[PDB]
Design a protein around this nucleic acid. Structure first.
Ligand SMILES: [Zn+2]
Length: 66
DNA sequence: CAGCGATAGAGAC
DNA sequence: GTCTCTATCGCTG
């Protein structure tokens, strides 16, 4: 389609967040967003998802990213 | 050209 | 000053 816009709604099975810079996955084949896969895998233990937030701090960038 | 992993940085008190 | 949590970068095919 010429729309090219959104067509596949990915869902984080851990926090349902649809806003993320990189989609991660669990060694079990379950889809995760950014922090869920990075944080859960490194901790190996469940932790209050209460850390759920819709606001993410944006960091600086390189001179130019193609 | 795009996607991913690992490491390090920053913030608040 | 120290500690924790999260994101981006660089590299390869
Ligand atoms: Zn998530």
């Amino acid at each position: 389609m010429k729309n090219g816009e959104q067509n596949g709604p990915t869902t984080c099975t851990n926090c349902f967040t649809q806003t993320t810079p990189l989609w991660r996955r669990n060694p079990e084949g379950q889809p995760l967003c950014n922090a869920c896969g990075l944080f859960l895998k490194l901790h190996g233990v469940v932790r209050p998802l209460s850390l759920k937030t819709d606001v993410i701090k944006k960091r600086n960038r390189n001179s130019a990213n193609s």
